[PDB]
RNA sequence: ACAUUUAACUAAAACCCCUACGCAUUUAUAUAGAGGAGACAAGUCGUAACAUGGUAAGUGUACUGGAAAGUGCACUUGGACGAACC
């Protein structure tokens, strides 16, 4: 998270690949020599590209610093590209009551609808002996509620020496969805 | 609605009416189904309250929510502010 604003008269790095206001390449110069050009022409330096290993800074007028981001306010509006996926966690118990399993199963439907990743963990119930035969039958019971909407990303594993099982769910991908749709129509309509 | 008759040298005889009660009305019971409260006391999801209970608590009202509840507006102390200046 950054902004196209002036860095000020405090430069962290001694050597900077300075750039002219008109786009001319001044070339690498000492940090002290950079401030001389900020006063000589009353201009502000903005870091154009952090990624490059050599420091890159371009000095431009205040109006030039407004027009730049004023276009970054439209590019994201016109073509927003927000793809981060939040990860959610749930820790259930083998002996979880059905009512609590229907309330937590409806919470997963809101997460899958918002394209989140649901990490589900199941633990041995309090003073209850149970294997992984019926302890792994809750995932299939939760996924069934979401037939097309959700599908496994990861699969049940013995995270902690078999006492607990962890799985990850995701929203069905567009392509996958179409495949599911296509299959559903043939079973009933063709018959 | 209904009618004064016979009799009368001692005096008597004669008499006999029609309409109500209902698909009205009152109260209670039985039954399909639905939903409270209590007792008992498991399990499950949380941790709302009691300490400034970890966002002080609560009243009224409104909206909201798996659930205790949360928020807004006004009100209360059945809260506190540490009690010379510095
Ligand atoms: K409270
Ligand atoms: Mg509490
Ligand atoms: Mg509290
Ligand atoms: Mg209140
Ligand atoms: Mg709210």
From Swiss-Prot:
GO terms for biological process: mitochondrial translational initiation; ribosome disassembly. It comes from the Eukaryota. The keyword Protein biosynthesis applies. Keywords: Initiation factor, Mitochondrion, Protein biosynthesis, Transit peptide. It is found in: Mitochondrion. One of its GO terms (molecular function) is ribosome binding. Its main location: mitochondrion. GO terms for cellular component: mitochondrion. IF-3 binds to the 28S ribosomal subunit and shifts the equilibrium between 55S ribosomes and their 39S and 28S subunits in favor of the free subunits, thus enhancing the availability of 28S subunits on which protein synthesis initiation begins. Belongs to the IF-3 family. This is Translation initiation factor IF-3, mitochondrial. It comes from Homo sapiens (Human). The chain holds residues 72 to 262 of 278 of the full protein.
């Amino acid at each position: 998270k950054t902004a196209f604003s002036n860095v000020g008269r405090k430069i962290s790095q001694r050597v900077i690949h300075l750039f002219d206001e008109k786009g001319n390449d001044l070339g690498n110069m000492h940090r002290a020599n950079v401030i001389r050009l900020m006063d000589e022409r009353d201009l502000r330096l903005v870091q154009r590209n952090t990624s490059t290993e050599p420091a890159e800074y371009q000095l431009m007028t205040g109006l030039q610093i407004l027009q730049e981001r004023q276009r970054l306010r439209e590019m994201e509006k016109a073509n927003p590209k927000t793809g981060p996926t939040l990860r959610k966690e749930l820790i259930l118990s083998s002996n979880i009551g059905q009512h609590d399993l229907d309330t937590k199963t409806k919470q997963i439907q809101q997460w899958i609808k918002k394209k989140h990743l649901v990490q589900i963990t199941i633990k041995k119930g309090k003073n209850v002996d149970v294997s992984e035969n019926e302890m792994e039958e809750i995932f299939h019971q939760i996924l069934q509620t979401m037939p097309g909407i959700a599908t496994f990303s990861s699969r049940p594993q013995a995270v902690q020496g078999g006492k607990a099982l962890m799985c990850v769910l995701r929203a069905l991908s567009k392509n996958e969805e179409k495949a599911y749709k296509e299959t559903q129509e043939t079973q009933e309509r063709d018959t």
